[PDB]
């Protein structure tokens, strides 16, 4: 009110909004494969000279089935991260399955040093694959050492990008540290070069109810209160909008069920108080806001009462009826009275009366009075002209 002395009445103030309590995330199960459906998983890989190339499709593109294993020393892509791979959607990934020497792992990296790799696996100028180092000695290990994984490829013609050393008798577990057989698992993939029909994996959280929480359902972010909904969605229907096209009903992606959505309870705050010098005690109420919430943020209360228009605070309910002193709503007004404290009552609509009607009864006035009653009316307001320029 910009004044040190407020008058008797009710005055609006800052609104009250229920704060979010936490966030909750729900997302679906197994999804579509571009990446490493099987390349990272097998007991036998293809030949080094016939380095494998697999097109992978339509199982879960899960790094939670690949990144879960702690065997890999480092799997962190230069351009992306496996942790953030959940949201990322791919177009196609190719599998480089073959067996090479333990010292030839980094030889698979782009711009490698050493011509041993080019003969068996040429490095493309635009490689997006991610070098992954995972223990693979036992899988390729042989009792006498396998020579089948030979590097006899010595074509004199130059080797192009994906157009299609032998210091050990074979791959033996007795080979020294770094000299053991190794298996290359690189997710060589292209994005937007092929049509997108795939997406990555996801993660889920727990479930809550009857709380103002932040919800994410298949990307459906928002804030509100969720509750089990008796509504019956269609088998292929997941979202529910109101007449004004506002989401009200959602279906849990993991467990089939429809949940209601309700905006977090809120409403205006109005302060009831008599004149300052009459008393410094004040009565505060929340408009259309139940006091099931009010202890959020004097929050103790100890003097509360629910009303159709709201659940006020600080005023003591009175079951008698008196003349309205300060309008509140739903036929409730508050006043300061006896020790003196603000009270709330119901409309004493007036002096109940019963005129003695009868068939042959007349009440003629025997006397009169002259009464002068004032009356005021606006006539004109101060004129005003504004010089635009």
């Amino acid at each position: 009110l910009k004044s040190f002395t407020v008058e008797k009445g009710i005055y609006q103030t800052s609104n009250f909004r229920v704060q979010p309590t936490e966030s909750i995330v729900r997302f679906p199960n197994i999804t579509n494969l571009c990446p490493f459906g099987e390349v990272f998983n097998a007991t036998r890989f293809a030949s080094v000279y016939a380095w494998n190339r697999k097109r992978i499709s339509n199982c879960v593109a899960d790094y939670s089935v690949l990144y879960n294993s702690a065997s890999f020393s480092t799997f962190k892509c230069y351009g992306v991260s496996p942790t953030k791979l959940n949201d990322l959607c791919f177009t196609n990934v190719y599998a480089d399955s073959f067996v090479i020497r333990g010292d030839e792992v980094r030889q698979i990296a782009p711009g490698q040093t050493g011509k041993i790799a080019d003969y068996n696996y040429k490095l493309p100028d635009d490689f997006t694959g991610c070098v992954i180092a995972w223990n693979s000695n036992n899988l390729d290990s042989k009792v006498g050492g396998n020579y089948n994984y030979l590097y006899r490829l010595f074509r004199k013609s130059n080797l192009k990008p994906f157009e299609r050393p032998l210091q050990s008798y074979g791959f033996q577990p007795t080979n020294g540290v770094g000299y053991q057989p190794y298996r290359v698992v690189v997710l060589s993939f292209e994005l937007l070069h092929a049509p997108a029909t795939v997406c990555g994996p996801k993660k889920s959280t727990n479930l809550v109810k009857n709380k103002c929480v932040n919800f994410n359902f298949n990307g459906l972010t928002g804030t509100g209160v969720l509750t089990e909904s008796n509504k019956k969605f269609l088998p292929f229907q997941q979202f529910g909008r109101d007449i004004a096209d506002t989401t009200d009903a959602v279906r849990d992606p993991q467990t089939l069920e429809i949940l209601d959505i309700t905006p977090c309870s809120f409403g205006g705050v109005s302060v009831i108080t008599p004149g300052t010098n009459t008393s410094n005690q004040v009565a505060v109420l929340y408009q259309g806001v139940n006091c099931t919430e009010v202890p959020v943020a004097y929050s103790t209360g100890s003097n509360v009462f629910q009303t159709r228009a709201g659940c006020l605070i600080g005023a003591e309910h009175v079951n008698n009826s008196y003349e309205c002193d300060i309008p509140i709503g739903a036929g409730i007004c508050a006043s300061y009275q006896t020790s003196q404290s603000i009270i709330a009552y119901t409309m004493s609509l007036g002096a109940e009366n019963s005129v003695a009607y009868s068939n042959n009864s007349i009440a003629i006035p025997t006397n009169f009075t002259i009464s002068v009653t004032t009356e005021i009316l606006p006539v004109s307001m101060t004129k005003t002209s504004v010089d635009c320029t």
């Binding site: 196609n92 092929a194 049509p195 029909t197 269609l234 088998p235 292929f236 979202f239 909008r241 009903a249």
Partner: protein, 260 residues
């Protein structure tokens, strides 16, 4: 024969659930009472032609035994550009996009009871040749009512093929009817079936068949080929979230008032 639509070509435009709301929508649609060409796939003549794909094509037929095994979506259908394959058997579809070189008659062609009065498979031209590929997939081994069981004609399979901005969808609805004549006066909605953003071009559309047939009895196979158009449709929702009625906003003044 240029037969006329009555109420078909209605499908849910979104997964959104609306109850007791007269939601209005703008999208590719088959205009009410917009008439559609009729094709009778014959077995001495033949009526299995190649038709354009004008950004949304509606299909419907009363066939049986999956005589129309599937369809071909692509640009060239000659392996110059990747082409799709929709051939479906009693088990499932084998959706396939590859640089595929087809043939003049690239369908399996079960010519049962045709000439020698028996069952046989004289060719397997479905896989003419897949010179090279970019993606392939076989849907879940379901069992949908595609085999031969007429009884009272109920195999009213409606297909709408929408491939917008790289997302390709499939809406259909098994429509059990009792009238064996031209499309009955009924209202139904094609529920979404599958989305597969194959991203390929499509501007042409040859269907597939399952059955030198000179003198052989004609083929009791018939179907419609409608084309959706971008139109504003006033759509109804009952208490269920099911489309009970629909109205076009440009068919006639009376309907426009409803839309307005």
């Amino acid at each position: 024969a240029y037969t006329n639509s009555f109420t078909r070509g209605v499908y849910y435009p979104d997964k959104v659930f609306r109850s007791s709301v007269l939601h209005s929508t703008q999208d590719l649609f088959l205009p009410f009472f917009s008439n559609v060409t009729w094709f009778h796939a014959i077995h001495k003549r033949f009526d299995n032609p190649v038709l354009p794909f004008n950004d949304g094509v509606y299909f419907a037929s009363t066939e049986k035994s999956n005589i129309i095994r599937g369809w071909i979506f692509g640009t060239t259908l000659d392996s110059k550009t990747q082409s799709l394959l929709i051939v479906n058997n009693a088990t499932n579809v084998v959706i396939k996009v590859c640089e595929f070189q087809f043939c003049n008659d690239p369908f399996l062609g079960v010519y049962y009871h045709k000439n020698n009065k028996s069952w046989m498979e004289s060719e397997f031209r479905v896989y003419s040749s897949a010179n090279n590929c970019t993606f392939e997939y076989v849907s879940q081994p379901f069992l949908m009512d595609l085999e031969g069981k007429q009884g009272n004609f109920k195999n009213l399979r409606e297909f709408v093929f929408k491939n917008i901005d790289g997302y390709f969808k499939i809406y259909s609805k098994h429509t059990p009817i009792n009238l064996v004549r031209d499309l009955p006066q009924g209202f139904s909605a094609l529920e979404p079936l599958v989305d597969l953003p194959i991203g390929i071009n499509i501007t042409r559309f040859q269907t597939l068949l399952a059955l030198s047939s000179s003198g052989w009895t004609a083929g009791a196979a018939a179907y419609y080929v409608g084309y959706l158009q971008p139109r504003t449709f006033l759509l109804k929702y009952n208490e269920n979230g099911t489309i009970t009625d629909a109205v076009d906003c440009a068919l006639d003044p009376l309907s426009e008032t409803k839309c307005t």
